[PDB]
Amino acid sequence: TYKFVNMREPSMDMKSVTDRAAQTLLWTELVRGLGMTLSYLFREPATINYPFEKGPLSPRFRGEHALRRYPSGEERCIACKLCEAVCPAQAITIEAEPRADGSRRTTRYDIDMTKCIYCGFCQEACPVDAIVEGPNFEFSTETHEELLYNKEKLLNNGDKWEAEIAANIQADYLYR
């Protein structure tokens, strides 16, 4: 099924030629273009008053990363290195070691936020929902080094955006 987009032949009767001539001299399609720009002038602009009116997002939004912890308080990451193994840009570096108490966690968990592609593959691979991408997207910085997060900064994010990340996965865990 195809349609011929431009195969219209104008009529040669005395009426049609005059209308085309009237269109030519008395610019009409130009007025129609003008007339519609006036229509948009009186309409309702769609601009949102940033930062007083932030844009609409979804619970699945991928932003700044953070390591969450169990309700008890102990971290969720058990250093399985799934997130590091599946990271498409190799932005994850992990070093683990037996903790003093037994059950062992990472001693180094660095995310290179200038090498990250924010694909979210880390939060899917994680079998304990430890590493997640938080809702924040306003962590722009003045220096390149401030982007290169390590375990401490990421753990701080987990203790800062927990009130929001907990609700997001609460609304989205059933889909996954």
| C-beta atoms surrounding 28 within 10 Å | 14
Are 48 and 161 within 8 A, CB to CB? no
Bridge partners (DSSP) of residue 109 are 94
Coil, strand or helix at 81? coil
Is 92 an interacting residue with respect to ligand SF4 (CB under 6 A)? Answer: yes
The residue to which tokens 């570096």 are assigned: 93
Select from ligand SF4, other proteins, none the partner in contact with residue 10, using the beta carbon and a kind-dependent cut-off of 5 to 8 Å. none
Q: Does residue 74 have a known ligand-binding role? A: no
Instruction: Tell me whether residue 19 or residue 59 sits nearer to ligand SF4 (CB atom).
Output: 59
Q: Does residue 133 have a known ligand-binding role? A: yes
Is 88 an interacting residue with respect to ligand SF4 (CB under 6 A)? Answer: yes
Select from ligand SF4, other proteins, none the partner in contact with residue 167, using the beta carbon and a kind-dependent cut-off of 5 to 8 Å. other proteins
Instruction: Tell me whether residue 28 or residue 148 sits nearer to ligand SF4 (CB atom).
Output: 148
Select from other proteins, ligand SF4, none the partner in contact with residue 111, using the beta carbon and a kind-dependent cut-off of 5 to 8 Å. ligand SF4
DSSP 8-state secondary structure symbol assigned to residue 99: B
Which alpha helices (H) appear in 9-91, and where do they start and end? 14-25, 29-41, 82-86
Cα 124 from Cα 117, distance rounded (Å): 15
Instruction: Tell me whether residue 12 or residue 58 sits nearer to other proteins (CB atom).
Output: 58
Is 122 an interacting residue with respect to ligand SF4 (CB under 6 A)? Answer: yes
* Token output for 56: 């609409």
Burial of 34 (0-12, 13-18, 19+ CB in 10 A): exposed
* Token output for 15: 């009426």
Is 54 an interacting residue with respect to other proteins (CB under 8 A)? Answer: yes
Binding residues for [4Fe-4S] cluster: 65, 77, 80, 83, 87, 109, 116, 119, 121-122, 126, 133
Chain residues in the site for ligand SF4 (CB under 6 A): 77-83, 86-89, 91-92, 94, 111, 116-122, 125-126, 128, 130-131
